C-alpha cells in the first residue's frame, strides 16, 4: 500500500526517479478542503438548541 | 591628602553573610594539657583493655 505521505502526481514526461511510478498507473485525486459537517435539518415545528 | 582613618560601617553585615562558623564537636573533646595523673590512669586502663581484647583475638 502507499504511505500516508505519498500522493503520486502525473509527470509531464519530465525526468522521474526509478522508484516513481509511471503516470499510466497514476490516477489523480481531486483536492479536498472541507472537513466539517453542515448543520442538520430538523422539524419545522421543533426549535433549535441555539435559541 | 588626609584620609578617613577607620570605620566599622558594613563590617557586621559582612560577618553575617557567611555566619559565625561554630567549631565542630571534635574541638570540645581535646585532651592536650589535662591532669597528669588523670591521663596516666586512662592510659593504663586503655593499655590493659586492649591487651585483654587482643588476647581473645589471638585465642580465637
Amino acid at each position: 500500500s502507499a504511505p500516508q505521505w505519498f500522493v503520486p502526481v502525473k509527470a509531464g514526461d519530465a525526468k522521474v526517479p526509478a522508484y516513481y511510478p509511471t503516470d499510466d498507473m497514476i490516477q489523480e485525486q481531486k483536492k479536498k478542503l472541507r472537513t466539517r459537517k453542515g448543520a442538520k435539518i430538523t422539524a419545522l415545528d421543533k426549535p433549535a438548541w441555539n435559541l | 591628602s588626609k584620609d578617613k582613618n577607620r570605620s566599622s560601617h558594613n563590617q557586621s553585615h559582612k560577618a553575617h553573610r557567611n555566619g559565625f562558623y561554630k567549631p565542630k564537636k571534635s574541638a570540645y573533646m581535646s585532651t592536650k594539657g589535662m591532669n597528669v595523673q588523670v591521663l596516666k590512669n586512662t592510659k593504663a586502663q586503655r593499655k590493659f583493655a586492649l591487651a585483654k581484647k587482643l588476647e581473645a583475638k589471638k585465642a580465637a
Binding site: 504511505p3 505521505w5 500522493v7 502526481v9 509527470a11 519530465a14 525526468k15 522521474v16 516513481y20 | -
Partner: protein
Amino acid sequence: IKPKIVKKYTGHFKRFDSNRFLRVKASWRVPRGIDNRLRRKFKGTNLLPKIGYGSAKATRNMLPCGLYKFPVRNTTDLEMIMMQNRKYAAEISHAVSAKKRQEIIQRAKILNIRVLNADARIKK
C-alpha cells in the same frame, strides 16, 4: 492547519547612537559604559534585547506560510523532506544555476513540496 504566530516585538533592536554617527553600525551591542543612558534603563531609552522577548517554542523559526525552511542544492536534497511536505518548505540556494533550478522546481511538483524560490532566475 496553521497556528497563530505571535511576535512580542516586531521592531528592530538598533545599536545606541547608531542614528547619530555613521561609524557606529546598527548591529546591536550592549552598552558597557559607566554612565550609559541605555544600560541604566532610563525612561524613554530602555529598550534592550532580553530572553523574555523570545517567541513561542511551538511557532519559533516558522515562516508565515506555516512551514519550516529547508535549503536544497539539487534534486536529491529534496528527497530528504518528501516525507514531511506538510512541515518543511524547500529553498533553492542562492548559488544554484538556472538549469539546476528547473529540475528542482519540476521535481518538487512531482513530490508535492512547496518551494519558496519558484520565481528565481526566470528567463526574460
